[PDB]
Structure formats: C-alpha cells, structure tokens
Structure 1
C-alpha cells in the first residue's frame, strides 16, 4: 500500500539560505522524493526545523540556534546512502 522507504526527510521541513551546490531547487527535490517537506523563506517565525547553507555566520548561528542549519552535503550524501545521517556532523548552526 505505502512504500515509506528512504524516508530520511519524512518529518523534516528544510529551508535553504545562501548559494548551495547543488542548487536549492535540486536539494529541495532530493528532500521531496525522500518523503520530505521544504520551506520557501522564513520571516523570524519557527515554520522550519532544518536550514541548508554553504556557510553560516556566527551571529546567524545564534539567529538560527532554534533551527538545525547544516551543509548541503547532509542532503546530497544521505540520498546517495539512502539512509539517515548525523546532521550534527554537517551542522553550520554550531
């Protein structure tokens, strides 16, 4: 009835900020195909759980302490492994 397989981003809404390789469109597609959800843009309010940056500045790590900011490699590599990865390894929020 329901595959529910490679559900790496199933409970995860992901926003992308800055210039990330590969493109924000591509990373967001990698999220969706893995049963995941995404966000276009935030305006201070907590309507996301994960953010993707190329690099994330220190005062913005404080700005986004509430949101698990990571490198695009979390999304790219998890999809290539078809498994959940430690986002704390790829963390740009800390």
Structure 2
C-alpha cells in the first residue's frame, strides 16, 4: 500500500534492529558468558550529550547484549534511560524511572558484570 510516514519509522526501527544484529554477528571476539550478556533483557536509550558519546556507547550496548532504542516512542518498552543532564520538567515527567549516568555502561563493561543502578543513579 502507500508508504505514508508512520510505517516509515517502523521500517527504520526494523532496519536498525537488523543492522545491530548484523554488527553483533560480525563482532565475535567477545567472550562467552562474560562481557556479552551483561545487559541481557535490557533496553537503553541515550538522551542528550554523553561523555562517551553515542555511536560508541551504542557498540558497547549492542555487543554486550540487549537492544538499543533510538526513539523513545513508548515509555513501557524501556528499562534504563541514560542522560547526563535533565531539566526540571523532564525530571518531573520521568519520575519513578531508572535514569543513570552514562558511565554506568562503561563501568559494567570494564567490571564484566552488571552493576546496580542505585549508586549510579542520576538523582543526587
């Protein structure tokens, strides 16, 4: 039928998922059960400026398990959201959500074990 524009975003998301799977298949140097499934059943969305930067943290997220989200269309289908800075309005809107510093992913990758977000929470 007509391509329109609503289905274009869905096709873009499907293509992003396929490319992430292809990149994961290409990157076979990761050890099994170590630094490869630390972010299992976890969805991470990058918001705002990050010190490691996106398209680099994206590789660490994709290779080490889990799915990467480029658009936060639905708030249910996301576990952890990464944002170095958040305004007051967005802090109010995103209450009771797990917002962590961008150093959490690199710390978990270096430690080779999933790290709790209690200490790495953006608040306080």
User: The TM-score by the shorter chain falls in which range?
Assistant: 0.7 to 0.9
SS in 2 for 1:25: coil
Larger mean CA deviation between 13-22 and 80-89 belongs to 80-89
Hey, what's the Cα distance between the residues in 2 that align with 1:3 and 1:90?
24
Gaps of 5+ in 2: 1-30
TM-score, scaled to structure 1: 0.81
- How many residue pairs end up in the alignment? 94
Higher relative contact order (CA 8 A, sep 6+): 1
TM-score, scaled to structure 2: 0.64
Hey, what's the Cα distance between the residues in 2 that align with 1:73 and 1:2?
23
TM-fit CA distance, 1:69: 1.1
Counterpart of 1:15? 45
